[PDB]
Design a protein around this nucleic acid. Structure first.
Ligand SMILES: Nc1ncnc2c1ncn2[C@@H]1O[C@H](COP(=O)(O)OP(=O)(O)O)[C@@H](O)[C@H]1O
Ligand SMILES: Nc1ncnc2c1ncn2[C@@H]1O[C@H](COP(=O)(O)OP(=O)(O)O)[C@@H](O)[C@H]1O
Ligand SMILES: Nc1ncnc2c1ncn2[C@@H]1O[C@H](COP(=O)(O)OP(=O)(O)O)[C@@H](O)[C@H]1O
Ligand SMILES: Nc1ncnc2c1ncn2[C@@H]1O[C@H](COP(=O)(O)OP(=O)(O)O)[C@@H](O)[C@H]1O
Lengths: 397, 390, 98, 98
DNA sequence: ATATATATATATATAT
DNA sequence: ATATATATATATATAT
């Protein structure tokens, strides 16, 4: 396992505004809202990486619609670019004005790995995404996720997000914990990971070979179901406890008479499945739901990314089988509601700053990404290709 | 002889943030509504399990839409999550507003079983689910429901509700009274129910054998269904009542019998994989089996078009679901608007056969260890009964 | 049918409906009302004047009428069975007009 | 493109934008703007550096470019050859990816 | 300001 | 498998 040292360090940026730069801002906000029909008091300020909150508490009889209908004029009042309005803080009575900083601050990925939350996260599939609105890192478990969608326009950063999630996978698990299968119809960027001791097939060329490896994923799911129905327990990690935590004393624990190894995690990462669903038809569309309907205890998790998120490629046949979604900067509230049912993803800044709904419900989370360089990736790839070997399960195609 | 104290007792009830100072919450609500353009009077609080309904009496002249257009800012004012308004109470003149206290008291299943009418229940196959909006015991009866359909939500307890219903079956029968049979392509969440003496079938793992199981299902159906017309009643409740009054008349008629439930779930894989013969059989073990004792609960993950066609949707009277896509799924099974207002992970929308409005139920969790204790307690008194026509 | 809002009896003639559509969302009574009209047919009739044919989707309740001397066929269950009865009615109407 | 309102040409790159929609009602400047974009391309790029593919659904404007050394195809007046050009473009895109 | 009728735009049911 | 229509949702100028 290679260390954290190959990334760029946590630099120093003094662009974090002065307390006067927020205080005069806050008094100017109170003056400008007092010039309209509303009346409000700034209760707290939270600075941020790019956008910046304002905990404001309206006095009495001041409905939030009288802020959300002043929004654009308030934005031109403070001479900033635009303002989204927080409808509710969870647990706290105040509404929030989100104002983006002009000099936005890029968040390096080693800053995301710098938390004690990452390295002392008990799971084997962390998904380090980046610092939130307030600046705290939010890293969530893929095993409890259980699946992800990624959508955004061209250039909006989906390659960077997928590289961030994959390097989140790489730094924590051994080869015998979490294998992965990569599929890329846009045959250009995800070939960079070829050579690691984690990656089952070679990183594929066409869907013509990759659909058969996805049927192999189906058969691996059936192997997993047969062996967990036989040996008794339900979760994958429950069974992987059950094997070694029975064979403290040395035994292979023969099973339905071959041996028993550990039970690794499988992660299907797909670059652009819109191409695959278009150029095949509905067979692969059936395969995706057939995976994602029987997966959470199977230890096969699905990462998808597209470019058009419309219902031509993501039907209701998938839409209830992948709860957790991420959308990057998109072009329409149509597509916004389509892959983020709350809607609001058309107001993104670009270059990361995605929406995210947790494994709760109905409440999107705006968390910035991590600008991961390709050379950081190349260092990590060299560090794995020295610390390992070309391990493969062939005849997967 | 089934035991009832086999599982864990009522440990705590969490006190719901106060037993007394929610009067302060009520006064704060009064002040917050007077801050807007209504004047209101608050009567006594119903401190429910998770949510909490308030007796709220508006003054004269005001309409209820001035509460409905004001609910969200009432909610952000009152330091709570998400409230809504019930615009009618049958009886008195008040207006209901329900508020979700966040400390969700996890519903102790043996406390649901400790209900007096659960012990005093007439039929032999009841369905206990838990507490209501006010928190009442909600023991229903699938001898009267008598078909049930479950939708799919990955994190709500679709498995937990099935095991709750099955333990509800188990603690109120004798082996010569209840029979069950399962079909599940996910052979994972349910196969702990092998070794049950209440069975009348081996636990069906495959699907061609499930197509052999539904054949014996309709065969037994039409067998007893024309035998019932031979014995001259109309419904199978009448059939079992009269064969009870015949066997406990002491006469050995034997002219050529217990209940039978079909706890098939994940039925989408049958209706997608093996073919159309599944739904062609399910349509006629669906509608006609109503007064036939075969009650046929069902559960899938994504009910829209192929998974449920209308000739299986319509026959089942009474339905149950969890939080699903904000699309046609929101009312395909649920019959109302329940897209994401159902919280999931504890609550559910019940429909009785009459009064087609969704009664919302606080469900009760069941540990898999509780399931294993019940499986082992029936495994002690565990003489099986398999049949091999399948 | 019953009484109106004044409580005066409201009885209609089926020969001048000429047909009838019944609604109800498992609400007030949808089985009742059909049963009511059918028993009201039966109390002023003879089988040489009015014989009925029912089609039963859910064989629940009106599989109770079997045995009466005005019922031209037994209970009908399948819709594919019921299409034969509907085409029988069309053919009977056609020879009726002939 | 030409000037903005504050007296400066705003010359935007096509290699980053990276595609383009142009629309408007008749006579508002459509074919003139297309000509401006084309002559903007032509005064820097040799046929080594760039080369055009042109499709005319109307044989009125983009017919003058017939015979410049910056064409991969003749000016597509026809309709089926336009589909052929799009097939070729997808094929050239995929082989350049490989 | 705010509920109403209208025009536009999307997702699904279905004929070939 | 593909093209077509209706139902449903959604944004918009208006009389209240
Ligand atoms: N967090 C970020 N901060 C700044 N720029 C970013 C960030 N994430 C992505 N980008 C920019 O987005 C571009 C990548 O977009 P890309 O994923 O290639 O879109 P597509 O794959 O659809 O073409 C990169 O050039 C990168 O500079
Ligand atoms: N009353 C409850 N309290 C706590 N958790 C619950 C309760 N009811 C259900 N759950 C949760 O529901 C989950 C079960 O989901 P499940 O029915 O297995 O979905 P699926 O079958 O689609 O995987 C469990 O993880 C459990 O934590
Ligand atoms: N006037 C009445 N007073 C009291 N109960 C009635 C009255 N009319 C009908 N009902 C009851 O209401 C029930 C409504 O049933 P119904 O909606 O017809 O069931 P279904 O929709 O399955 O036919 C009837 O079964 C009947 O017993
Ligand atoms: N910058 C300009 N100055 C003056 N006239 C112009 C200018 N741009 C366009 N026009 C007029 O508009 C016409 C181009 O419109 P065109 O592209 O033909 O629209 P369409 O093709 O829809 O008819 C030209 O013939 C010219 O007369």
């Amino acid at each position: 396992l290679p260390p954290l040292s190959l990334l760029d360090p946590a630099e120093v940026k003094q662009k974090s505004y002065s307390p006067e730069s927020l205080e005069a801002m806050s008094r100017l906000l109170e003056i400008k809202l007092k010039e309209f029909g509303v009346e409000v008091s700034v209760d707290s300020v939270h600075p941020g990486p790019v956008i910046t909150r304002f905990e404001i508490q309206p006095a009495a009889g001041v409905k939030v619609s009288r802020i959300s209908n002043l929004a654009k004029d308030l934005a031109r009042s403070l001479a900033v670019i635009s303002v989204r309005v927080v409808e509710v803080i969870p647990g706290k009575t105040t509404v929030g004005i989100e104002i983006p900083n002009e000099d936005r601050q890029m968040v390096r990925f080693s800053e995301v790995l710098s938390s004690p939350e990452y390295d002392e996260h008990k799971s084997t599939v962390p998904l380090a995404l980046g610092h939130d609105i307030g600046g705290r890192p939010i890293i969530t478990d893929l095993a409890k996720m259980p699946h992800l969608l990624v959508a955004g326009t061209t250039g909006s950063g989906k390659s960077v997000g997928v590289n961030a999630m994959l390097l989140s996978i790489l730094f924590k698990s051994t080869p015998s914990e979490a294998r992965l299968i990569m599929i890329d119809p846009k045959m250009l960027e995800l070939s960079i990971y070829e050579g690691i001791p984690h990656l089952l097939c070679p990183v594929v060329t066409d869907m013509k070979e990759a659909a058969n490896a996805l049927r192999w994923s189906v058969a691996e799911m059936e192997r997993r179901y047969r062996l967990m129905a036989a040996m008794g327990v339900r979760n994958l990690a429950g069974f992987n406890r059950k094997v070694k935590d029975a064979e403290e004393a040395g035994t292979p624990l023969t099973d339905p008479p071959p041996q028993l190894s550990t039970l690794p995690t499988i992660v299907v990462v797909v670059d652009e499945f819109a191409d695959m669903m278009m150029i095949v038809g509905k067979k692969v569309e059936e395969l995706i739901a057939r995976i994602a309907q029987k997966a959470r205890a199977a230890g096969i998790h699905l990462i998808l990314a597209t470019q058009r998120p419309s219902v031509d490629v993501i039907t209701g046949l998938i839409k209830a089988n992948i709860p957790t979604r991420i959308a990057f900067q998109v072009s329409s509230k149509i597509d916004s509601r389509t892959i983020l049912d709350q809607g609001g993803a058309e107001q993104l800044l670009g270059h990361g700053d995605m929406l995210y709904l947790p494994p709760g419900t109905g409440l999107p989370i705006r968390v910035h990404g991590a600008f991961v360089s390709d050379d950081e990736v190349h260092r990590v790839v060299e560090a794995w290709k020295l610390r390992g070997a070309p391990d493969y399960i062939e005849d997967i195609l």
